[PDB]
Design a binder for this molecule. Sequence first.
Ligand SMILES: CCCCC(=O)C1=C(O)C(=O)c2c(O)c(O)cc(O)c2C1=O
Ligand SMILES: [Cl-]
Ligand SMILES: [Mg+2]
Ligand SMILES: [Mn+2]
Length: 179
Amino acid sequence: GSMEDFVRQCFNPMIVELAEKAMKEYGEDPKIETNKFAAICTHLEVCFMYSDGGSKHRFEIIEGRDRIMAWTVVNSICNTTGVEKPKFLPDLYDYKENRFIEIGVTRREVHIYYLEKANKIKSEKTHIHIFSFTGEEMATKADYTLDEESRARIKTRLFTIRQEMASRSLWDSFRQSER
Ligand SMILES: CCCCC(=O)C1=C(O)C(=O)c2c(O)c(O)cc(O)c2C1=O
Ligand SMILES: [Cl-]
Ligand SMILES: [Mg+2]
Ligand SMILES: [Mn+2]
């Protein structure tokens, strides 16, 4: 109950509505699966923060879009470059280094998640980039895409959430709840 409260206090209304949508599409109730709610909100925020990271329109956002537009963006980019169309929707496209990006956000250790992602997606083409709430980060062939300045600004936001969750005692539960 106080997590739902937190979610609507801490996150911008656009992120909140996108999350509710994304959850209801799998039949999960945000008022009930409140730890998934917060987890989705955070993932989306990082995506949006990451996309502002570098040069102006360095990145095309794919996450947060409906499936048709999402795929329109993908199919369009593979048609005009020739980079292998992926088997799943990624999170961004990097116009500077011509590759898609999967972004992950983990409550566990950053190596455990990176493994699951790598095996989950296969397609050697795409890029992975994990963040934690404790400031850890792991990237594909250790290539961190953004500059250290913008990267820290994300990890700093992720920490404050961890703290502000802990402040309301919600964190202990939120950390055990990742599947
Ligand atoms: C299990 C198969 C279902 C697909 C799914 O729910 C996910 C996404 O669409 C997605 O876009 C996604 C991230 O972007 C992500 O960073 C972590 C994830 O765990 C997911 C997902 O798990
Ligand atoms: Cl807000
Ligand atoms: Mg969007
Ligand atoms: Mn992702």
